[PDB]
Write a protein that binds this ligand. Structure first.
Ligand SMILES: C[S@@+](CC[C@H](N)C(=O)[O-])C[C@H]1O[C@@H](n2cnc3c(N)ncnc32)[C@H](O)[C@@H]1O
Length: 223
């Protein structure tokens, strides 16, 4: 049922006008950066142990990196993002832990050699009206992340899954869970206009069931 229900949600979402979309997207949603709040939520729930060498793949402005850099078990943060035309570039600030981060823009992380890391973070996935476009980008991220997880036996991880209801993606996630453990969670701070979920090392759950539960929740909210 998962692809059917998420696909229904997507087609219904795309039928909303500007006013309906704006009202729908915040309905019952919890709530400085959105990025910070989401990683903080996952961290406080025990979704991911932030420790040692943290990689932040697709760091954009870098909220996750600054979050990670302020945590007691983190030793360094290596942050990477495209930062090319019309893509977010890291925003340097003077907050606690800033000196632990190395930001590198102008890097396509899908083409980077994995290296040593104790925690793998990745928040790549831009919403697109076409669910199949989102599935393809999601698959690409998961394939890249699998190489990192293979290279770093036992590392912690927290990975955005932009479209988790697509059948190919579900099978990909089950395979990652079979290989690396972990589970798939919905952050209640996510807006109703995205079906994004997070593949995390700290929580071990029923992936397909959680996805379906999120589809049914987001559909009910649109009713
Ligand atoms: C919007 S950030 C997610 C938010 C971020 N965690 C934060 O807290 O600010 C996702 C970033 O991934 C970047 N990105 C997308 N594809 C990429 C790729 N192939 N290689 C490197 N960065 C990529 C995008 O430019 C985008 O800025």
């Amino acid at each position: 049922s998962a692809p059917t229900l998420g696909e229904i949600w997507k087609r219904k979402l795309n039928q909303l006008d500007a006013k309906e979309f704006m009202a729908y997207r915040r309905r019952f949603v919890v709530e400085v950066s959105r990025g910070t709040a989401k990683l903080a939520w996952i961290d406080e729930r025990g979704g991911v142990e932030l420790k040692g060498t943290v990689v932040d793949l697709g760091c954009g402005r870098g909220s996750w990196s600054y979050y990670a850099a302020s945590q007691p078990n983190v030793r360094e943060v290596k942050a990477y993002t495209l930062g090319t035309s019309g893509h977010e570039k890291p925003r340097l600030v003077e907050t606690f832990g800033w000196n632990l981060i190395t930001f590198k823009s102008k890097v396509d992380v899908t083409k980077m050699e994995p290296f040593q890391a104790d925690t793998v973070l990745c928040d790549i996935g831009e919403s697109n009206p076409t669910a199949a476009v989102e599935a393809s980008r999601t698959l690409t991220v998961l394939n890249v992340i699998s190489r990192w997880l293979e290279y770093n036996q036992g590392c912690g991880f927290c990975v955005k899954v932009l479209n988790p209801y697509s059948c190919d993606v579900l099978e990909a996630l089950m395979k990652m869970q079979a290989r690396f453990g972990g589970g798939l969670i919905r952050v209640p701070l996510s807006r109703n206009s995205t079906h994004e979920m997070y593949f995390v090392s700290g929580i071990k759950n029923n992936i397909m069931g959680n996805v379906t539960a999120v589809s049914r929740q987001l559909l009910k909210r649109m009713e």
